[PDB]
């Protein structure tokens, strides 16, 4: 295991602020149309942070024009410029799966800062 550990950790990334599930944050992703590199800003709620090591991923969810959209990344990808953190939130689960329904319908289903 230790072999996998270090030969991977060579490629690790050491600038991401710590963050638990259930807190909004902005993400700066480098999309490229073949010519330039726009920087799409995509922010939402962290639904799930899964797995360990270089394989650790996470999930962000947001709504835009009625429909909700999910989006995941491997936390150590170089495709990401930076990760701000907007607001912490108090939750009890570690997988905010229940949010997939209580979004509209006037259901003010939000978090509360710690």
């Amino acid at each position: 295991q230790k072999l996998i550990e270090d030969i991977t950790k060579e490629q690790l990334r050491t600038d991401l602020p710590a963050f638990r599930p259930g807190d909004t944050l902005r993400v700066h992703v480098k999309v490229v149309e073949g010519n330039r590199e726009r920087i799409q800003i995509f922010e939402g709620v962290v639904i799930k942070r899964r797995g360990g090591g270089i394989s650790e991923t996470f999930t962000v969810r947001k709504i835009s024009y009625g429909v909700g959209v999910e989006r995941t990344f491997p936390v150590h990808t170089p495709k990401i410029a930076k990760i701000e953190v907007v607001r912490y939130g108090k939750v009890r689960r570690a997988k905010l799966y229940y949010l997939r329904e209580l979004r509209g319908k006037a259901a003010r289903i939000k978090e509360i800062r710690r």
């Binding site: 799409q40 024009y65 009625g66 429909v67 909700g68 959209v69 989006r71 990344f73 491997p74 495709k79």
Partner: protein, 122 residues
Amino acid sequence: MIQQETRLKVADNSGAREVLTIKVLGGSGRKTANIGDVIVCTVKQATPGGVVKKGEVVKAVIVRTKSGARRSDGSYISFDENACVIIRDDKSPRGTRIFGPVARELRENNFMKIVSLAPEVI
């Protein structure tokens, strides 16, 4: 993971509201079709006006699916409803508006007009 008999709701000001999948174009089997593909489908509910009438046979592309595509860089993307856009027998759409965002695997294909008409692409 759209397949035969799946129901979809269109995302344009064509006149239809929801549609039913009849056949998935492509090879011979083609059990299913993911995002960024074209199917043949029949209208089930339409607005009283609209350029499309209830109970026809038309072609449509797939713009959003609940199960979502997987990009090459390891990132994923998903939605929470299956949508589609009616095709005027060629990549040109038939309506004029587009509602809700669309995926990004359309620009990799030849659907320039749609991805231009979208409010935002993800």
